[PDB]
């Protein structure tokens, strides 16, 4: 299988990257031509954040962290299913039973993280209600 | 003009001067890409794509995920080029001169009429011959799922 | 399978640059002690078209050529040089026959293979004509070992997987035989 | 039986409500699982049949009578450790409830026992790397099981980094071996034991030397052991050495086929250096766990001399030493988990901050234990006297047997240094005995009611109220008399070690 | 060294269960009720909380029975396996095994059973499950396949021992036994 | 193949952001690549020097063992 | 025993035959020692790295240098760019020297 | 086609990837190479017989 | 050059920079295995490389989890 046609494509796309950047740099009118008030550098008002107009100045939930952390074990489970795809016929029943076992052990992990509700954001800080109880004497 | 040398010299230049964690994560991506590209050509196209799918797609974006969580806070040109040049001189990883100067070939044969990809053979052996290695791996993955939750989960 | 090797042509010229591949020739012919043979000159498509007729005609020599490789015990290339010329001569015999008996039936079929990704499933109409011609003029038949006669794939009247695009020369030649022969 | 029950405990623990009683009851389910494992193991595995060595699972795992000895030992020591987390070590709810605050504690321990028991059996470089990670990953999780603790998490971070570098060295040696030979099975490599770079197996040992805390790598182990909770340090400072030292012994068995002297000189350089640091290091220390970390390094140095010598007497020296040292280690740490009830309470100077993770942290917190509990003080005295090497305790026979193996192979220099290093280390074992008893007669008649044990409620005032729980007391007493009275059955035990073979045969 | 006759180096899972002695079922029963008892015995030894005996909650007793249900079976499975390997008393099983095999060869069926697994898959399966009961205390693995690498010589099932000739079984030459390696490679030397 | 696409773009930003160092690293790279195409042997000599200073079998050393054997295997034919 | 040296198509690769002959000798029962198998061990290492054969190529390169033999006349003709495997070079009767198509098969 | 069998450029030029206990011994220790050079020498030492 | 331990200059001054160096170090081991396996036409070396990539991923996840909890442990006032 030849890939010299593919190589020229990758090279052209690499050339297309330089063209997109520089075409802006050669077609925009000179700062003097428009208003001359300054370049992007000195014009710090124009080169700044957007805060809807008013100038101002990540303790993320642990549930978000466990979403990203648990992505890695579940990704290596999916990527290790790749060898079974292109060899499903020649491993027969034996490799099919092994594959199912390879999935059951990982599912017991899915059960564990489903019961603990690890991914739920939860609301421990707020949403409290109480019963007004009179304390007659 | 083996341009793969110039990519690493740039990479070796920025590894000596990186200060924050943004550049440190950049050295990771700037190292896999030469690893993937030098595997795509030459040695193994299958493991170039496995590296992209597993390293870049899975373990690299996790680094930048936690860097946004951790924090973002806070040499001389002569010594760097002197060090890089000194690092550049001696690049022979092995000292078997004949093994590095004499070329070899293989002879093909037509005895293998059932031609199938490497990933076909790897699955053929991993799911039959070394099914213990495959099963322990799912066991190591299982411990991580439990291991991540016990370390990080608050309550 | 498009794995890189050290034994044939690789995917791209960037593989060659990394490996510093030299494509080396050897002008030296074989020594006169080994009697010469006329090598087969057919390309990929004609061989895949006549493969089952080489199997039908050179079956004894192919088996004997392989049995020499099994029992040479690692010295196969050197100790089977004489038995390897019978196979080359036998296979040249078949291609020479197809050129002098079924030249148009043969060419039609392997033009179809060169038109349809060298797949047997896409060229059944041309292949059926070639098999019928070869049988009457050389007595060779196509047989796939290991299955009953009634369940061979190339005799399947209504195949599940059929060519997407038709070969014009195959469809035209087929219906002509539906008049010449199906009287 | 271990693996199948682990899945049941994983699922069941994630169902039932988070509570201490249920967490403690699940810890008693694991104590059964480990017991059941030992009964099934001893039933099928016999010394008489495993003598030849038997390949299992496509030759990935090879089991013989030397490995089989340690699997049963590992299972036994894991029973004595689980007894701590499964029963009361003090009975005071404040101190004890730490052991029951984590539900995955017993699960991670059961993960490690699978990792520990399979490591000596490995027979393929592909499975060597996988199994060593299964054990290594389980230790990091156990070190960080108390995720609220700042010191515990700081230690697991230090443990993970050092182990990751250690595992990379192990992985790189195997790759280099595969580069030279193209073979993965260890038996196939033995066919080329004369044709490969024998120093690439030494690079493998340098990775396993980091994981047992051998100098110059000793620095991290001392820091880790002095920061983790005493219940955690009781496990991570003993178990890895049980399964790695067995593996190191086997790798050295194959190495001595070609009998390369340069390999032996480098290892002797590390053994010699470690004895120096293991002895002179502990002289100036205040923390008890830092003291037992230097003590651990010295004993690993002794056990490597038996490994390095690697003769027929080296099997006996190693097999006996690894057993007696485990029981001594369990006995000492079990006592330190108990005698925390005798600590005084303030009603000041030096502002010593104590936490519920290491209630006993300094050596002078052992003061006057001869007064508060004389019987347990002698048990700690007998245990320390074994570490010193005073006969006829178990500790003497370990050093005596190690010396036989060392001198029989010409390691004269190392034998003398170990006898110098033993005496230097006696200084800081004697300090523990000085603190235990020497100020008895001045404190004999004192008005003590501010001890931690005096905050225990009075139940009835008529029935007898024992101060220490039942199970922990029986373990301490049993292992103290076994240490003390080994002379009675020593001849049978040693003759029971002559039979443990590693391809000796005839 | 207590050595006996090697009935089967890799006994099949279904065979090992069919060869349980009554005592083996007792061990399986004892293991099943031992684990719930061990939980109770610990509470008698020492209460989990407080100072007085308190029966553990029924939920713990159900999970305890399951854990002891597998452990009892594993102990039963390994004890039954020692007999096949020859490590234990196997005279009773040897006659029972010989009766089945001599009957099997007589019907021209394979003693080992027909198999979906091809030659490589049969031999590969044997490698995984042979001597796998030695680590059955760590993780489970059973021979559930009808392979042919059992570590016996089928010639030894032709000779008649004491009390066997009365069976009057006729044994054909192995070359005519269906699904054996000595009866398959008749057309090609690499295809069965 | 991703470095084929990225290499043109990264080189532009390498010179734009840090031109002076980029000249040297590109200057250094071209110096050795030319020496390989023109056989200046400057990198070969440092390799042949390093092997001598660290005890390795150099190309000269291997050839010497050939000459000792050359003379000796001829000397028997005397 | 476990399979080692499996080719990219599931069969024995180039050097499996040598490795198998080593295992036959080492595990043989008629051998008192491992001396007879020492040559087979060298062949398996030789099959994989060709270190001795590469060394032989080094002397033949070095011996021709000291004799002045012209490399182009002792060596074998070669082509470095695959596009210039032209029919003139391949020896075809009426072959041009125009480049060949190695873009897409 | 004849091609070389040298390790990748990244494996032998990266500022970090090239550092390893065994890669230094391949690069800076003669122990391995002197042992193997004996076998090459003894090839031509055995042509006399 | 690397005998003076130059690679220590190339590793940054954060705990996350150590984690990356461990990955780049192990990456060299896998690339070495893929190199040998392809030359020998041996798929057993490719099985090893596949395991090394999968095992090197699990090591990253555990290390980051410890680092993440290490970070929030300081920022654990949460008395708002
Ligand atoms: C079935 C239901 C069951 O077995 O347990 C009920 C159990 C009780 O549910 P619950 O009402 O929430 O329990 C409340 C009690 O307090 C929970 O306490 P519990 O004591 O009442 O039940 C917990 C259970 C322990 O639960 C388990 O061990 C289930 C293990 C499955 C994994 O312990 C037992 O009761 C022992 C008897 C059943 C155990 C089954 C062991 C043989 C394996 C089949 O439910 C489950 O655990 C469901 C787990 C099954 C998940 C799906 C697995 C699918 C796998 C196959 C799919 C592909 C083919
Ligand atoms: C940290 C790492 C952890 C690693 C461990 C993780 C867990 C892994 C361990 C799990 C097991 C590992 C092995 C799995 C890989 C092997 C798969 C395989 O060989 O496929 C080929 C195999 C086909 O080979 P075959 O030549 O056709 O043999 C036919 C029968 O298998 C055999 O024919 P037969 O002559 O033995 O008798 C046929 C008839 C029994 O015929 C009789 O003689 C009657 C016996 C009376 C009943 C005995 C009591 C039944 C059980 C209690 O049916 C049976 O009972 C066969 C036994 C299978 C029943 C369930 C076995 C559970 C074991 C687990 O595929 C199967 O049929 C396996 C079926 C069982 C499913 C797998 C069991 C686990 C789920
Ligand atoms: C298609 C091209 C894509 C890349 C475009 C950027 C090219 C510029 C050169 C950087 C890439 C070279 C590879 C080595 C990494 C070096 C990263 C670094 O040190 O910082 C570069 C960048 C600019 O900062 P600089 O002034 O150069 O350094 C001092 C700043 N305090 O500091 C920054 O972080 C600014 C944002 C840059 C983010 C780049 C992310 C890393 C690169 C990944 C994409 C390219 C992958 C590597 C391909 C080449 C490998 C040699
Ligand atoms: C509790 C201790 C249980 C001891 C059980 C030891 C055992 O059963 O195996 C002994 C083992 C010999 O076994 P083997 O040679 O392989 O052949 C026979 C197998 N049927 O011999 C061995 O080699 C095992 C080596 C480890 C032995 C450790 C010594 C036991 C220490 C006793 C600790 C007692 C603690 C007090 C228990 C309190 C309980 C509340
Ligand atoms: C059948 C599988 C589940 C067993 C459930 C049946 C059972 O044993 O009940 C639990 C038993 C008595 O039930 P109990 O809770 O007292 O009555 C309801 C009061 N609210 O409470 C107990 O005392 C526990 C007795 C356990 C009996 C054995 C359970 C075996 C479970 C199957 C294991 C294999 C699957
Ligand atoms: C467990 C169920 C066991 C019963 C069963 O169905 O498996 C037996 C079956 C045998 O089928 P059979 O055609 O008779 O094989 C001999 C042919 N010469 O075996 C088979 O053919 C297929 C076995 C598949 C059963 C596995 C499903 C369980 C889930 C896997 C995990
Ligand atoms: C593709 C886009 C097609 C339509 C847009 C073309 C407009 C750009 C033409 C231009 O820039 O012409 C004006 C220019 C210069 O004058 P300026 O105003 O300073 O240029 C602004 C851009 N510089 C300053 C970056 C160059 O003249 C020439 O260089 C004549 C040639
Ligand atoms: C075939 C022989 C089997 C013998 C029995 C074995 C199981 C022990 C359980 C008995 C019942 C029980 O626990 O009874 C309870 C007693 C007494 O407890 P106490 O301290 O007075 O608590 C206070 C009791 N109140 C509530 C009445 C006040 O506990 C014991 O004496 C425990 C003895 C230690 C265990 C011995 C095992 C030795 C292991 C040796 C192998 C290495």
CA gyration radius for chain B?
22
Q: At C66, is the secondary structure helix, strand, or coil?
A: helix
Do D268 and D414 contact (CB within 8 A), yes or no?
yes
Would you state the structure tokens that stand for residue D207, as one six-digit string?
A: 């990775």
Do A118 and A110 contact (CB within 8 A), yes or no?
no
Residue D458 backbone phi and psi in degrees, to 5: -85, 125
Do D197 and H31 contact (CB within 8 A), yes or no?
yes
- Calculate helix-pair angle for I15-40, B21-38, nearest 10 degrees: 0
Would you state the structure tokens that stand for residue C154, as one six-digit string?
A: 């190339």
Give chains near D: 3+ CB pairs under 8 A.
Answer: A, B, E, G, H, I
> Among positive and negative, which fits the CA dihedral E63, E67, E70, E75?
negative
C-alpha to C-alpha distance for F14 and F22, rounded to whole angstroms: 7
H16 CB near a chain I CB, below 8 Å? yes
Residue nearest to atom 10 of ligand 8 (CA): E45
Give the residue from D80, D100, D94 showing the smallest Cα distance to D27. Answer: D100
Judge residue C56's burial from the number of C-beta atoms within 10 Å of its C-beta, 0-12 exposed, 13-18 middle, 19 or more buried: middle
> Which segments within H1-49 are labelled E, that is strand?
none
C-alpha to C-alpha distance for D267 and C110, rounded to whole angstroms: 71
Pairing of strands D61-63, G78-79: unpaired
Do D353 and D346 contact (CB within 8 A), yes or no?
no
Would you state the structure tokens that stand for residue D62, as one six-digit string?
A: 């090879």
Do H29 and B132 contact (CB within 8 A), yes or no?
no
**Residue bearing tokens 């690679």:** I7
Q: Which of B2, B42, B103 sits opposite C15 (nearest CB)?
A: B42
Would you state the structure tokens that stand for residue D244, as one six-digit string?
A: 């790695």
Would you state the structure tokens that stand for residue F73, as one six-digit string?
A: 């295997």
Instruction: Give, rounded to a whole angstrom, the gap between the first and last alpha carbons of chain C.
Output: 47
**Residue bearing tokens 């490719």:** I46
Contact G78 C23 (CB under 8 A): yes
G12 CB near a chain C CB, below 8 Å? no
C-alpha to C-alpha distance for D47 and D41, rounded to whole angstroms: 12
Resolution, expressed in angstroms to one decimal: 3.3
Would you state the structure tokens that stand for residue E131, as one six-digit string?
A: 């001597």
Contact A7 F4 (CB under 8 A): yes
Q: Which residues on H lie below 8 Å from G51 (Cβ)?
A: 36, 39-40
Contact G8 I40 (CB under 8 A): no
Q: Which of F2, F14, F43 sits opposite B10 (nearest CB)?
A: F14
Q: How far is the CA of D335 from the centre of ligand 8 (A)?
A: 20
Residue G79 forms beta bridges with which residues? C23
- Calculate helix-pair angle for I43-74, B61-70, nearest 10 degrees: 10
Would you state the structure tokens that stand for residue C67, as one six-digit string?
A: 């049995």
Q: At B138, is the secondary structure helix, strand, or coil?
A: helix
CA gyration radius for chain G?
22
C-alpha to C-alpha distance for I55 and B138, rounded to whole angstroms: 11
A15 contacts: CB under 8 Å, gap ≥ 6: F8
Would you state the structure tokens that stand for residue D352, as one six-digit string?
A: 């010593």
> H-helix or E-strand containing C131?
helix C124-138
Q: At F2, is the secondary structure helix, strand, or coil?
A: helix
B16 contacts: CB under 8 Å, gap ≥ 6: B75, B80, B83, B84, H15, I9, I10
Q: Which residues on D lie below 8 Å from A112 (Cβ)?
A: 10-11, 14
CB atoms within 10 A of CB E184: 13
Torsion of CA E117, E123, E125, E131, to 10 degrees: 150
C-alpha to C-alpha distance for D2 and D74, rounded to whole angstroms: 13
Entry field: residues in chain H: 49
Residue D287 backbone phi and psi in degrees, to 5: -80, 135
C-alpha to C-alpha distance for E81 and E150, rounded to whole angstroms: 13
Q: Do chains I and F touch (3 or more CB pairs under 8 A)?
A: no
Do D363 and D291 contact (CB within 8 A), yes or no?
yes
- Measured in whole angstroms, how far is the alpha carbon of residue A34 from the centre of its chain? 40
The experimental method is: cryo-EM
Do E178 and E108 contact (CB within 8 A), yes or no?
yes
Pairing of strands C23-24, D54-56: unpaired
Would you state the structure tokens that stand for residue D146, as one six-digit string?
A: 């108390």
Q: Which residues on B lie below 8 Å from C11 (Cβ)?
A: 45
Q: Do chains E and I touch (3 or more CB pairs under 8 A)?
A: no
Pairing of strands D61-63, D54-56: antiparallel
G11 CB near a chain C CB, below 8 Å? no
Cα→Cα distances D356→D231, D298, D351, E130, G78, Å: 11, 29, 16, 50, 78
Instruction: Give C160→chain B minimum CA distance, Å.
Output: 23
- Measured in whole angstroms, how far is the alpha carbon of residue C6 from the centre of its chain? 26
DSSP codes, C92-105: HHHHHHHHHHSHHH
Question: For residues A20-44, b (16+ Cβ closer than 10 Å) or e, as one string?
Answer: eeeeeeeeeeeeeeeeeeeeeeeee
| Ligand 7 site, residue A24, Cβ cutoff 6 A | no
Give the residue from D311, D200, D173 showing the smallest Cα distance to D263. Answer: D200
- Calculate helix-pair angle for D312-338, D239-255, nearest 10 degrees: 170
Residue I12 backbone phi and psi in degrees, to 5: -70, 180
Cα→Cα distances D360→D95, D145, D352, Å: 11, 20, 12
Cα→Cα distances D227→D16, F49, I15, Å: 32, 51, 19
C-alpha to C-alpha distance for F77 and B73, rounded to whole angstroms: 81
Q: At C109, is the secondary structure helix, strand, or coil?
A: helix
**Residue bearing tokens 């291609």:** C95
Contact I52 D171 (CB under 8 A): yes
The atom number, within ligand 5, closest to the CA of E62 reads 26
C-alpha to C-alpha distance for D144 and D163, rounded to whole angstroms: 14
Do A22 and B113 contact (CB within 8 A), yes or no?
no
I43 contacts: CB under 8 Å, gap ≥ 6: B118, B121, B122, B125, G6, G7, G8, I37
Judge residue E5's burial from the number of C-beta atoms within 10 Å of its C-beta, 0-12 exposed, 13-18 middle, 19 or more buried: middle
Residue nearest to atom 21 of ligand 1 (CA): E59
Is the link from the previous residue into D461 a cis peptide, with omega within 30 of 0? Answer: no
Q: Give the per-residue SS3 of chain B.
A: CCCHHHHHHHHHHHHCCCCCHHHHHHHHHHHHHHHHHHHHHHHCHHHHHHHHHHHHHHHHHHHHHHHHHHCCCCCCHHHHHHHHHHHHHCCCCCCCHHHHHCCECCCCCCCCCCCCCHHHHHHHHHCCCCHHHHHHHHHHHHHHHHHHHHHHCCC
C-I contacts (CB, under 8 Å): 4
Q: What region does A120 belong to: left with phi over 0, alpha with psi -120 to 50, or beta? A: beta
């Amino acid at each position: 299988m030849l890939q010299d046609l593919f190589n020229n494509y990758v090279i052209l796309v690499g050339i297309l990257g330089l063209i997109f950047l520089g075409v802006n740099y050669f077609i925009v009118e000179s700062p003097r031509m428009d208003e001359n008030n300054g370049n992007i550098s000195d014009y710090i008002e124009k080169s700044g954040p957007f805060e809807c107009g008013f100038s101002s100045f990540n303790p993320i939930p642990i549930a978000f962290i466990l979403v990203a952390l648990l992505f890695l074990p579940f990704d290596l489970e999916v990527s290790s299913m790749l060898p079974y795809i292109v060899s499903i016929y020649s491993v027969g029943i034996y490799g099919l039973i092994i594959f199912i076992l390879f999935l059951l052990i990982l599912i017991v992990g899915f059960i564990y993280e489903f019961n603990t509700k690890s991914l739920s954001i939860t609301t421990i800080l707020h949403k409290k209600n109480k019963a007004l109880v009179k304390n007659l004497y | 003009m083996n341009l793969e040398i110039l990519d690493l010299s740039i990479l070796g230049f920025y590894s000596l001067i990186s200060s924050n964690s943004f550049e440190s994560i950049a050295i990771l991506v700037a190292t896999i890409m030469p690893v993937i590209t030098e595997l795509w050509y030459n040695y193994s196209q299958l493991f170039a794509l496995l590296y992209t799918l597993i390293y870049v797609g899975a373990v690299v974006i996790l680094f930048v995920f936690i860097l946004s969580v951790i924090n973002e806070k806070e040499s001389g040109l002569f010594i760097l080029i002197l060090v890089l040049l000194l690092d550049d001189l001696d690049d022979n990883e092995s000292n078997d001169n004949d093994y590095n100067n004499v070329y070899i070939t293989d002879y093909a044969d037509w005895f293998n009429n059932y031609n199938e990809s490497d990933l076909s053979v790897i699955g053929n052996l991993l799911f039959t011959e070394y099914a213990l290695l495959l099963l322990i791996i799912s066991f190591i993955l299982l411990m991580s799922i439990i291991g991540l939750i016990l370390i990080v989960k608050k309550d | 399978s498009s794995t890189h090797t050290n034994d044939s042509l690789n995917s791209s010229n960037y593989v060659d640059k990394l490996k510093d591949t030299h494509f080396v020739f050897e002008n030296d012919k074989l020594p006169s002690e080994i009697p010469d043979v006329e090598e087969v000159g057919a390309t990929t498509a004609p061989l895949l078209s006549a493969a089952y007729f080489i199997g039908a005609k050179c079956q004894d020599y192919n088996d004997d050529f392989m049995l020499c490789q099994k029992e040479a015990k690692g010295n196969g290339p050197i100790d089977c040089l004489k038995e390897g010329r019978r196979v080359t001569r036998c296979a040249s015999g078949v291609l020479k026959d197809l050129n002098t008996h079924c030249s148009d039936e043969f060419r039609l079929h392997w033009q179809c293979l060169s038109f349809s990704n060298l797949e047997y499933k896409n060229c059944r109409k041309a292949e059926s004509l070639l098999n019928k011609c070869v049988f009457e003029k050389m007595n060779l038949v196509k047989k796939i070992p290991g299955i009953p006669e009634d369940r061979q794939i190339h005799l399947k009247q209504n195949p599940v997987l059929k060519p997407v695009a038709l070969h014009q020369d195959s469809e035209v030649a087929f219906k002509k035989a539906q008049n010449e022969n199906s009287i | 039986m271990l693996f199948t029950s682990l899945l049941l405990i994983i699922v069941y623990g994630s169902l039932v409500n988070k509570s201490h009683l249920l967490t403690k009851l699940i810890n008693r389910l694991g104590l059964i699982i480990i017991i059941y494992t030992l009964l099934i193991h001893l039933n099928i595995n016999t010394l008489e049949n495993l003598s030849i060595g038997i390949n299992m699972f496509n030759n990935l795992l090879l089991i013989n009578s030397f490995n089989n000895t340690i699997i049963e030992l590992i299972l036994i020591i894991c029973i004595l450790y689980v007894l701590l987390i499964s029963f009361n070590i003090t009975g005071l709810s404040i101190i004890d409830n730490l052991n029951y605050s984590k539900r995955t504690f017993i699960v991670i321990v059961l993960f490690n026992i699978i990792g520990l028991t399979l490591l000596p059996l490995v027979n393929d470089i592909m499975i060597l790397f996988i199994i060593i990670e299964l054990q290594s990953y389980s230790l990091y999780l156990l070190t960080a099981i108390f995720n609220e603790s700042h010191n515990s998490t700081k230690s697991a971070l230090y443990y993970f980094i050092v182990g990751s570098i250690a595992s990379f060295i192990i992985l790189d040696a195997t790759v280099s071996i595969y580069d030279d030979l193209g073979l993965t099975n260890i038996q196939y490599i033995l066919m080329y034991i004369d044709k490969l770079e024998i120093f690439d197996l030494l690079c493998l040992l340098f990775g396993l030397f980091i994981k047992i805390g051998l100098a110059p790598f000793y620095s991290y182990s001392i820091t880790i052991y002095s920061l983790s909770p005493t219940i955690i340090t009781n496990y991570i400072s003993l178990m890895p050495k049980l399964s790695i030292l067995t593996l190191i012994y086997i790798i050295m068995h194959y190495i001595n086929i070609v009998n390369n002297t340069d390999l032996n000189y480098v290892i002797s350089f590390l053994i010699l250096i470690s004895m120096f640091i293991g002895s002179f290091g502990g002289l100036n220390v205040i923390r008890i766990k830092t003291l037992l970390a230097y003590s651990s390094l010295l004993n690993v140095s002794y056990m490597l001399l038996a490994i390095l010598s690697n003769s027929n007497e080296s099997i006996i020296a190693y097999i006996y030493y690894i057993i007696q040292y485990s029981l001594t280690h369990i006995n000492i740490f079990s006592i330190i988990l108990v005698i925390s009830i005798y600590l005084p309470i303030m009603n000041n100077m030096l502002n010593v901050m104590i936490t519920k993770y290491s209630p006993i942290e300094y050596i002078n917190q052992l003061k006057n234990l001869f007064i508060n509990n004389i019987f347990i003080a002698i048990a700690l005295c007998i245990s320390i006297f074994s570490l010193i090497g005073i006969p006829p305790l178990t500790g003497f026979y370990g050093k005596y047997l190690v010396l036989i193996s060392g001198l029989n192979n010409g390691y004269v220099l190392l034998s003398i240094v170990l006898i110098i290093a033993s005496s230097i280390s006696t200084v800081y074992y004697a300090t523990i005995l000085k603190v235990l008893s020497f100020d008895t007669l001045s404190f004999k008649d004192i008005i003590s009611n501010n001890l931690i044990i005096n905050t225990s409620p009075e139940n009835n005032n008529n029935e007898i109220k024992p101060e220490i729980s039942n199970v922990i007391s029986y373990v301490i007493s049993s292992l103290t008399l076994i240490i003390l009275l080994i002379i009675i059955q020593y001849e049978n035990i040693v003759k029971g070690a002559y039979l443990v073979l590693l391809y000796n045969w005839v | 060294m207590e050595t006996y006759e090697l009935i089967d180096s890799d006994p099949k899972f279904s065979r090992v269960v069919r060869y349980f002695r009554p005592s083996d079922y007792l061990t399986w029963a004892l293991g099943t009720i031992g684990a719930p008892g061990l939980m109770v015995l610990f509470e008698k030894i020492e209460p989990a909380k407080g100072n007085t005996f308190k029966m553990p909650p029924p939920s713990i007793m159900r999970i305890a029975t399951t854990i002891g249900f597998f452990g009892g079976f594993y102990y039963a499975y390994t004890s039954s396996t020692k007999r096949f390997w020859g490590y234990s008393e196997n005279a009773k099983e040897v006659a029972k095994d010989r009766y089945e095999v001599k009957k099997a060869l007589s019907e021209k069926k394979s003693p080992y059973g027909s198999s979906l697994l091809n030659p490589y898959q049969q031999d590969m399966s044997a490698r995984n499950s042979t001597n796998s009961q030695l680590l059955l205390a760590i993780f489970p693995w059973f021979n559930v396949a009808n392979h042919q690498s059992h570590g016996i010589d089928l010639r030894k099932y032709y000779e008649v021992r004491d009390g066997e000739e009365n069976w009057n079984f006729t044994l054909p030459p192995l070359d005519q036994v269906k699904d054996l390696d000595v009866a398959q490679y008749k057309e090609y030397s690499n295809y069965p | 193949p991703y470095l084929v696409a990225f290499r043109p773009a990264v080189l532009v930003f390498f010179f734009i952001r840090q031109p002076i160092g980029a000249g040297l690293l590109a200057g250094g790279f071209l110096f050795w690549q030319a020496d390989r195409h023109f056989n200046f042997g400057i990198r070969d000599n440092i390799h042949n020097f390093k092997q001598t200073i660290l005890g390795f079998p150099t190309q000269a050393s291997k050839w010497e063992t050939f000459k000792q054997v050359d003379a000796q295997k001829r000397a028997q034919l005397v | 025993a476990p399979l080692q040296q499996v080719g990219r198509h599931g069969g024995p690769n180039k050097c499996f035959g040598e490795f198998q002959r080593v295992v036959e000798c080492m595990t043989n029962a008629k051998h008192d020692s491992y001396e007879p198998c020492n040559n087979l061990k060298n062949d398996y290492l030789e099959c994989r790295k060709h270190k001795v054969e590469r060394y032989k190529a080094f002397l033949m390169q070095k011996h021709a240098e000291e004799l002045g033999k012209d490399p182009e006349e002792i060596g074998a003709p070669f082509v470095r760019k695959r596009r210039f495997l032209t029919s003139k070079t391949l020896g075809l009767v009426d072959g041009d020297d125009y480049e060949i198509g190695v873009e897409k098969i | 086609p004849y091609s070389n069998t040298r390790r990748p450029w990244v494996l032998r030029r990266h500022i970090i990837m090239k550092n390893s206990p065994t890669k230094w011994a391949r690069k800076y220790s003669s122990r391995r190479d002197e042992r193997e050079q004996e076998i090459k020498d003894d090839y031509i030492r055995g042509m006399g017989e | 050059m690397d005998l003076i331990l130059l690679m220590l200059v190339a590793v940054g001054l954060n705990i996350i920079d150590i984690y990356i160096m461990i990955e780049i170090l192990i990456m060299g081991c896998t690339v070495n295995t893929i190199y040998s396996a392809s030359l020998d036409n041996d798929m057993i070396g490719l099985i090893y490389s596949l395991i090394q990539i999968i095992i090197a991923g699990v090591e990253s996840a555990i290390g980051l989890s410890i680092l993440v909890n290490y970070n929030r442990i300081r920022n654990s006032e949460e008395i708002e």
